[PDB]
């Protein structure tokens, strides 16, 4: 269902990405962080972690994840922790593996963010 | 001790529900109680074991400014891990300061709350080891029928509950936002929380109420965000607040030091 909107609807996919950048910046700008490139800016897990706290109203202690990840391993660990936080929030386990996010798989990234969007639409 | 029997609980009315579970008003063995039902993803035997080892420590019956957990329902056989405490009619300090539609507590009462909390914390700081994962804030102090403040043992977090999610960062020491508990002086971190409570009693405002939790922790940890020392308070309340919120954890007083300071402030 998300595959069709990715592979066979560029007319949709672009209102989508416009709106997904709108959505994430709504929340991330509060930390004075801007997202301009959906393809890479969530790969290291940091913004996903920060986003989840913004959407679900908690702080994430800085000893709990790697704020400046220094290896592939730390990024995967950050992403995995982010998926755990999504599950804590009532989302079913994310389809992509954490590595798919770290490797900048755009469909995966956009699925995750879109699955956030469907949930956290009305959140301010 | 096999805990409290869940079937013996008379659930009267539901009071709240959120991320951590639900709270009910109820009755048990001639007690008016609140029942805290904990919601936990991926419950396991190891977690149930940890809950059952962690709860006994909260059953503190020896200090007037400490509100014990009366007991807990083990799960299994209970449907969910559950804590029982006495019902507190005025609710939390937070409810009383910020959500009180009948009367506004006076500053004499505020000083008495501060002294009550300091006495309760001095006592808890004598325990060895310290009760782990206990955060002091205005939601984790209850107000009894005679306006006595009591540190709420039912508000301690368990090892299996959300260690990467802080919901009351405004009260947490800057070092505790960033360092593992084992790498911080926990007693000194609690004194920061008490300093923020002093601020809240002086201003009658929620600290950083205009910011989301994520905003608060990031800004306090990384940008030096701090409560604004209130205009027009006595030199003596000012000095006490400043000393308690020392940036250097090691220079913050102990609770047993501020008790006599607060006793002299009474009347």
UniProtKB/Swiss-Prot annotation, chain A:
Start and end residues of each Calponin-homology (CH) domain: 14-121
Top-rank lineage group of the source organism: Eukaryota
Region Required for interaction with TESK1 and ILK, residue ranges: 1-124
UniProt-reported outcome of changing residue 23 to D: Loss of interaction with ILK. Loss of localization to focal adhesions
Subcellular location: Cell junction, Focal adhesion; Cell membrane; Cytoplasm, Cytoskeleton; Cytoplasm, Myofibril, Sarcomere, Z line
Tissues where the protein occurs: Widely expressed, with highest levels in heart, skeletal muscle, kidney and liver.
Subunit structure: Component of the heterotrimeric IPP (ILK-PINCH-PARVIN) complex composed of ILK, LIMS1/PINCH and PARVA; the complex binds to F-actin via the C-terminal tail of LIMS1 and the N-terminal region of PARVA, promoting F-actin filament bundling. Formation of the IPP complex is dependent on protein kinase C and precedes integrin-mediated cell adhesion and spreading. Interacts with TGFB1I1. Interacts with ARHGAP31. Interacts with the actin cytoskeleton. Interacts (via C-terminus) with TESK1 (via C-terminus); the interaction inhibits TESK1 kinase activity. Interacts with PXN/PAXILLIN (via LD motif 4).
Family the UniProt entry places it in: Belongs to the parvin family.
Summary of the function given for this chain in its UniProt record: Plays a role in sarcomere organization and in smooth muscle cell contraction. Required for normal development of the embryonic cardiovascular system, and for normal septation of the heart outflow tract. Plays a role in sprouting angiogenesis and is required for normal adhesion of vascular smooth muscle cells to endothelial cells during blood vessel development. Plays a role in the reorganization of the actin cytoskeleton, formation of lamellipodia and ciliogenesis. Plays a role in the establishment of cell polarity, cell adhesion, cell spreading, and directed cell migration.
Protein name, UniProt field: Alpha-parvin
Organism: Homo sapiens (Human)
Covered residues, full protein: 249 to 372 of 372
Curated annotation (Swiss-Prot), chain B:
Name of the protein in its database record: Scaffold protein ILK
Free-text comment on this protein's domains from its UniProt entry: The kinase domain is likely to have lost catalytic activity but retains ATP-binding activity. ATP structurally stabilizes the kinase domain and promotes stability of binding to PARVA as well as focal adhesion stability. The PH-like region is not required for assembly of the IPP complex or for localization of ILK to focal adhesions.
Name of the encoding gene: ILK
UniProt main location, coarse: other
Source taxonomy: Eukaryota, Metazoa, Chordata, Craniata, Vertebrata
MF terms in GO: ATP binding; integrin binding; magnesium ion binding; protein kinase activity; protein kinase binding; protein-macromolecule adaptor activity; signaling receptor binding
Modification after translation: Phosphorylation by PAK1 modulates ILK subcellular location by promoting its nuclear export.
Topology relative to the membrane: Peripheral membrane protein
Protein's UniProt keywords contain Lipid biosynthesis: no
Natural source organism: Homo sapiens
PH-like: annotated span: 1-28
GO terms, biological process: branching involved in ureteric bud morphogenesis; caveola assembly; cell differentiation; cell morphogenesis; cell projection organization; cell-matrix adhesion; establishment or maintenance of epithelial cell apical/basal polarity; fibroblast migration
Any one cellular-component term (Gene Ontology): membrane
Result for mutant: residue 62 to A: Severely reduces PAK1-mediated phosphorylation and increases nuclear and focal adhesion localization. Reduced cell proliferation and cell migration
Family affiliation: Belongs to the protein kinase superfamily. TKL Ser/Thr protein kinase family.
Effect on the protein of changing residue 41 to A: Reduced interaction with PARVA. Decreased focal adhesion assembly and reduced cell migration
